Design a protein around this motif. Structure first.
Motif, PDB file in Angstrom:
ATOM      1  N   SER A   1       0.822  -1.206   0.000  1.00 18.77           N
ATOM      2  CA  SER A   1       0.000   0.000   0.000  1.00 18.77           C
ATOM      3  C   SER A   1       0.857   1.258   0.000  1.00 18.77           C
ATOM      4  N   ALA A   2       1.941   1.264   0.777  1.00 19.09           N
ATOM      5  CA  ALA A   2       2.783   2.451   0.860  1.00 19.09           C
ATOM      6  C   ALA A   2       3.563   2.674  -0.428  1.00 19.09           C
ATOM      7  N   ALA A   3       3.993   1.594  -1.081  1.00 20.55           N
ATOM      8  CA  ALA A   3       4.782   1.722  -2.298  1.00 20.55           C
ATOM      9  C   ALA A   3       3.951   2.177  -3.487  1.00 20.55           C
ATOM     10  N   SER A   4       2.628   2.111  -3.390  1.00 18.81           N
ATOM     11  CA  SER A   4       1.748   2.523  -4.471  1.00 18.81           C
ATOM     12  C   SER A   4       1.195   3.928  -4.287  1.00 18.81           C
ATOM     13  N   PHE A   5       1.610   4.640  -3.239  1.00 22.97           N
ATOM     14  CA  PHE A   5       1.188   6.015  -3.012  1.00 22.97           C
ATOM     15  C   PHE A   5       2.291   7.018  -3.321  1.00 22.97           C
ATOM     16  N   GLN A   6       3.442   6.898  -2.667  1.00 17.37           N
ATOM     17  CA  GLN A   6       4.484   7.903  -2.790  1.00 17.37           C
ATOM     18  C   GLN A   6       5.795   7.314  -2.300  1.00 17.37           C
ATOM     19  N   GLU A   7       6.893   7.801  -2.873  1.00 18.56           N
ATOM     20  CA  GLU A   7       8.239   7.415  -2.459  1.00 18.56           C
ATOM     21  C   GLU A   7       8.417   5.898  -2.534  1.00 18.56           C
TER      22      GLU A   7
END
Length: 49
Positions: free
Chosen positions: A30-36
DNA sequence: GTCGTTAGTTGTGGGACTAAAGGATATCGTGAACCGAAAAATTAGTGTAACGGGTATCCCACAACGCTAG
């Protein structure tokens, strides 16, 4: 054997922005598909999430 | 007088910036000469006809009666 009582950690409530809260989720997908993406994938690989 | 510490800059670096459709581009400058590689084209060399029985198949036509006497 001599032992001492464990010391509990102390903490304070903190107000976090929505972007940081989204980027600090327990799921690295989930975090890798939003930003950075590079940063999240780096930390996930080093930590073996 | 001198050395480590802390906080507040200050400069510098890395990371974001709706959704739907569409979606064509033009792209310099030159040094020589010989050898090797393989891919291609050109050239050189050999040829049947009917017959004996005997028998497998085909097409093509025809047959497959009726009556009288010893």
């Amino acid at each position: 054997v001599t032992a001492r009582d464990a010391v509990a950690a102390t903490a304070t409530p903190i107000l976090q922005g929505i972007t940081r809260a989204s980027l600090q989720t327990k799921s690295f997908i989930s975090a890798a598909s939003f930003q950075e993406t590079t940063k999240v994938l780096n930390e996930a690989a080093v930590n073996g999430k």
